[PDB]
Predict the structure of Cation-dependent mannose-6-phosphate receptor.
Amino acid sequence: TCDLVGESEKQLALLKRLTPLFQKSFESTVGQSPDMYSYVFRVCREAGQHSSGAGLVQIQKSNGKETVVGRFNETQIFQGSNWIMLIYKGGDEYDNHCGREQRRAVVMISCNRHTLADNFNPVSEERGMVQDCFYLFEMDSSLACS
Amino acid sequence: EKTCDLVGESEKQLALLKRLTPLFQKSFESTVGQSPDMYSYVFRVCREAGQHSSGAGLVQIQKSNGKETVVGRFNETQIFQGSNWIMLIYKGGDEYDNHCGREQRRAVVMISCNRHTLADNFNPVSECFYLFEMDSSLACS
Ligand SMILES: *[C@@H]1O[C@H](CO)[C@@H](O)[C@H](O)[C@H]1NC(C)=O
Ligand SMILES: O=P(O)(O)OC[C@@H](O)CO
Ligand SMILES: O=P(O)(O)OC[C@@H](O)CO
């Protein structure tokens, strides 16, 4: 399961508030041909098929190259008025961008009082996230409501 | 005449900045903590926040003596729009003295869609990086 970065029982409780999503699998594909990437995200569970401990991976559809965007063994989580921010650090280092630092995944879970979990997608396409050196994603969930 | 300076430029982020102009003139504030250690957070969109912090977009004010600590500068701005929320980031703040590796402070502000107010309810979420939030119909789409 998710391992908190650092004990903030506040974040611990939050991981528990999110367990109803652990077994679900979210995917979103952005961009057009030659050039199309598929993002697979999971909550405190393996997201890739060639990785270990990946929380969110990027898959180049042209050749299936799977890049780890963030790991759930380095999780951070915060709760706003009607959203929950989930962060997965320790992803693969950029090859020739953003100072070759480790990739990081940020998922903004917005309160949606009519779905337990739905509409996951990057806040991009893949020709903008790398430019901004920020993998920002979003999804809906009543779990993010308060 | 100094406005937000996009980090890095990204006509999408420049458009978002224009979309947020109605807030430039407004002032946001929220106080946390109990005497005598209360802090006041002042936030402004593409304008200066405190009274003694040039280029500061968001400042932490010690209510006891008014000492200002810069959390983020609007000349190192980043902005993203999701579906029913806009994220505003201000970097280049005063570096920590004994925390986060002396690391320059950063301000992350989650502007949530609220169809019933142009701007309101600004307050910190948690105090690395400082996470804040507020409501605005401008973040509604
Ligand atoms: C998280 O897992 C990665 C991959 O094995 C590893 O390199 C890193 O040291 C781990 N970090 C923690 C929190 O143990
Ligand atoms: O297709 P996504 O956006 O990943 O949502 C899947 C979820 O509805 C499965 O229960
Ligand atoms: O109290 P805050 O959150 O700073 O909002 C003030 C704003 O409503 C003034 O027009």
